[PDB]
Ligand binder design. Structure first.
Ligand SMILES: [Cu+2]
Ligand SMILES: [Cu+2]
Ligand code: NA
Ligand code: NA
Lengths: 620, 620
């Protein structure tokens, strides 16, 4: 019944038939992206209109199209040819991963470089990497992928231990041409293996780990209705899934007594960028937008009970489309469960003699994704006390290079002759705010130091200042950990019983933002990442901080272009964009597979409730 | 057998007898502090010498003494009269808590102020607060406590909801004199109650929370031997307990294959300070060193299975001394258990087709303490991958005031007429480092931005710089979140297989440090808190960042005085002092009892192991 229900297999078959009868899905076509569109502002129209956005690629070489279709009304709504030299290529196709290794396997120049290194071609894996935009003018308009080579000694070998440095090729995957092959010098191929399941490397496994058993004998405290509508401990929300963004949260709300109070209309990780800091021309072009270029949702793992998700777990299995419009189920793609979170509140009073202790709990909603050497867990947490937290978990295998003779200021050595280039993982959270409704605004809050003097005779005083962001042109903000800087999203027209506007406070981790030079290509294409916080006026088509077509776009689209409109955000329908990430100087302990590292943010109520919202929690 | 074993009841009886026969523990004496001394550097002396340090107070008015005794040799080792006007008062006695309310209950000036507010004296609770050092010259040399009044409407009432503003008194607890009573004006006593167990306030309790069951059918994976020696998942350590510091960790080490590698010799929270930012003369003197002035260990709660500690929990019950030298057991004062911590490592490889997932685990060691309105949980965590984390959990009831007519820049309103002054909770972690032994050093690590140009043609490069701290005079460091600043403690004489010095990286949360004016009394007495990081050369008697006698000391002792020696720390026996804390602008949701807020730090291996140390973890 709900317009926010997950796309069904049936709905996706219907989309493929509508594109077929309309003659848009010919045998030369590929679906590069398919997703349900969110209902428009003011869903007061009786009965939904399930619409779908589709990106259609033409392998033969024709121009691609952007298509909207209504499955409610079996009709194509719009269909637009795209000039990709202008607005950007389409997302990388999964079938294109192999084409780079196969195109290179017959190229004369490729084989010359391999033979000079005594590499058997059937042993060389080639990674299909996004091209970006640089100085090669013949790439404009063309669908380009660059290739980096790794040696696999045998089928089960970890190729990441054997990079082939000094060598890169570029590939046009439509016309199937190796446009360039660059060989800047021979580097020794690192010899040590990195197979983390070889008893030779692991040694004997531990016998010391006794089991931890986490059960819920009466089942879980949350309920799911309609496929994806969660109700848990006064929280209410819909779990959506998009093949580009991954897990999306809609209609996050809190049942304060008898009325349902909205908090966030839509929450998602709307882009990630991984820029590399090795200035070597073999790699100085390396930057991946995993979300924008590859679509992280389509590589969601299936999560195993007992290994990935432990406890009483409820699964969701979202449906996406393959390149031909057939429905594909991702079995057990989303984990949801509650877990114990220690003490919520505690006090033993000397004067009343009353002792009081309550436990905290969190709702967990997660999925895990693999793009090549990288694996990423996306975790959303809901806590009893109203706090909302996001956490990214980064693991997998580090991207490797050779370690140069006598060192490097931009690469870490992980094993003899084996290096790891410096890089970042930067995420963009897009928070469509709905603090007690849609009239919201953002204040910046700084700690204020006071000087010893009149009115502050003992020099102990300190305060805080709040600056309202009224226009988009002044809502591009930087962190300042030293002054305790946070941001409050409030509703100026909704007050608590103290006659204060209700609000939520955003707590950032204050990690470094984009390190690249402001004149670089990557600072241009990933402008959102140069700043910690952006606020925009909501608009239906302002969906991604980089725009709709990241692959080989020349830069400027998305956030820098939205805020140019200089719209009013003082008490309006606004969207908060928060940049946060990890700056990774790889360590020996990251090799040969890396332990999880984490980064995130959280939002806590700030005068949203009239008292603590967890007075009614039992003792058990 | 171990010299780091917890003090026993027998040992404490023996201490009381030795002080008795020696005529130091007369009927006018009080033990204000008793603790075991750590073994000296080079414990190669066969058989230990269990020594004890004792602070002895004289209620009659004589001078107090500092005494060392050996229970191994039943002899007093040293005994020193103290000039407390010079070196500071002794810690606050527990029996002194009542004396302020009883001394004030017969004072003419106190009763005059109460009658002008129609307060029945038998209903007024008085909080015994530390005095600090300010402008009152008659306080030098005297044992002073200040008193703030709260109304209790009935025995089980929460007095914190009913502060009596505009009123403070000062009290000499030795001669029993009310030295001053200041009444700066009448404020309405806030009327709403804050009883969080009253069904009227809580409403009906939730019936929606189903149970979470955490069991270990084969028992826990860690072993305890000798009372307090932990071995768990290659970790090894001793859990100590001191009535001032609380839980202390000794001899933290990691079993890397066959050899036992030390990491940290001694870890403790060596001081906490809570400064208030309300400039009102009723409160502008308010600062508590809970550790230094009150001794947090002696207020450790007893932790209930199922409420405070959930799972398969092992308890320790430490023994301390009461004011008369009788042993007092704190039943179930320390919780230790392991808990599941999600995914440790994960990768699905496209080319090898191998799927790999491991879970992480943490060892938990905690206690909980109550000082008046405040409750604090101290958590030390040990992780499979070598990470060490500390976490403070702050809860209890916020300290309250009246909320003034038409607002305040230094106080939050929590209920009609009820305010909460701004304040901080600042902790000092003292880390006696032993990275693969005692030759250690500290480098500061900053991210380095590079300009687009020659050698960096595409403007993508970035690097990092490490600055060695060689003398104490240059080891007073500040955070800088914007440049990713961290600190590495390494051993220049111990290398990994890449010929890099092994090391651990300290990750700080980068919260604001002491906000008070640098000329304030509190910036003088709490100098450690004005800076994020200090490094000192180890010395037996350099134990606390504030010195041994915090109560009413005029300032400068501890860290600022140690570093003046300008000793060498480049490859030496060093101690790291890390300042971290919470800046608390109270919110409505903090009332009437506050949900937990957290702050901490962590240390991760940085080239300490030759590869990942968790390759040998099973799948289960
Ligand atoms: Cu990384
Ligand atoms: Cu506080
Ligand atoms: Na909004
Ligand atoms: Na040391």
């Amino acid at each position: 019944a709900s317009p926010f229900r997950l796309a069904s297999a049936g709905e996706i078959s219907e989309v493929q038939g509508i594109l077929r009868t309309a003659g848009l899905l010919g045998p030369e076509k590929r679906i590069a992206y398919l997703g349900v569109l969110d209902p428009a502002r003011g869903a007061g129209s009786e009965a939904e209109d399930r619409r779908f956005r589709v990106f259609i690629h033409d392998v033969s070489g024709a121009r691609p199209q952007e298509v909207t279709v209504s499955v409610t009304n079996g009709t194509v709504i719009s269909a637009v040819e795209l000039d990709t030299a202008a607005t950007g290529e389409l997302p990388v196709l999964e079938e294109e991963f192999e084409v780079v290794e196969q195109l290179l396997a017959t190229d004369e120049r490729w084989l010359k470089a391999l033979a000079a290194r005594n590499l058997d071609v059937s042993k060389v894996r080639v990674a299909p990497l996004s091209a970006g935009v640089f100085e090669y003018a013949e790439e404009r308009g063309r669908r380009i992928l660059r290739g980096l080579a790794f040696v696999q000694d045998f089928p089960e070998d970890s190729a990441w231990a054997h990079p082939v440095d000094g060598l890169v090729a570029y590939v046009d995957v439509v016309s199937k041409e190796v446009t360039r092959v660059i060989d800047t010098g021979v580097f020794p191929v690192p010899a040590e293996h990195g197979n983390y399941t070889d008893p030779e490397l692991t040694g004997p496994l531990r016998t010391t780990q006794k089991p931890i058993s986490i059960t819920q004998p009466e089942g879980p405290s949350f309920t799911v209705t309609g496929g994806n509508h969660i109700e848990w401990e006064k929280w209410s929300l819909d779990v959506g899934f998009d093949v580009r963004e991954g897990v999306v949260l809609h209609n996050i709300a809190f049942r304060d007594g008898d009325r349902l109070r909205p908090i966030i209309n839509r929450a998602s990780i709307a882009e990630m960028v991984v820029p590399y800091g090795d200035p070597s021309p073999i790699r100085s072009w390396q930057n991946y937008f995993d979300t924008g270029e590859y679509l992280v949702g389509q590589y969601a793992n299936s999560l195993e009970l007992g290994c990935d998700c432990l406890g009483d777990i409820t699964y969701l299995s979202p449906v996406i489309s393959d390149a031909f419009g057939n429905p594909r189920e991702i079995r057990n793609g989303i984990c949801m469960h509650e877990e114990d979170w220690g003490i919520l509140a505690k006090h033993s009073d000397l004067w009343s003699g009353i002792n009081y202790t309550r436990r905290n709990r969190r709702m967990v909603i997660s999925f895990f994704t693999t793009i090549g050497n990288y694996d990423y867990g996306f975790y959303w947490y809901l806590y009893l006390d109203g706090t909302i937290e996001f956490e990214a978990k980064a693991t997998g295998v580090v991207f490797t290079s050779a370690f140069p003779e006598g060192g490097s200021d931009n690469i870490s050595q992980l094993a003899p002759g084996l290096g790891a280039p410096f890089h970042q993982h930067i995420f963009s959270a897009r928070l469509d705010m709905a603090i007690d409704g849609f009239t919201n605004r953002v204040e910046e809050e700084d700690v204020v130091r006071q000087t010893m003097g009149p009115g502050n005779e003992r020099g102990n005083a300190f305060s805080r200042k709040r600056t309202v962001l009224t226009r988009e042109s002044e809502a591009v903000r930087e962190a300042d950990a030293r002054t305790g800087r946070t941001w409050i999203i409030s509703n100026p027209e909704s007050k608590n019983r103290l006659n204060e506007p209700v609000g939520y406070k955003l707590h950032a981790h204050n990690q470094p933002t984009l390190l690249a030079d402001p004149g670089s290509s990557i600072a241009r294409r990933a402008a959102f990442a140069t700043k910690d916080l952006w606020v925009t006026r909501y608009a239906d088509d302002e969906r991604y901080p980089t725009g709709d077509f990241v692959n080989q776009h020349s830069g400027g689209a998305g956030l820098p272009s939205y805020i140019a409109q200089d719209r009013d955000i003082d008490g309006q329908d606004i969207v908060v964009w928060h940049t946060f990430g990890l700056t990774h100087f790889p360590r020996v302990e990251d090799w040969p597979i890396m332990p999880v590292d984490t980064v995130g943010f959280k939002l806590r109520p700030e005068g949203f409730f009239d008292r603590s919202p967890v007075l009614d929690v039992p003792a058990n």
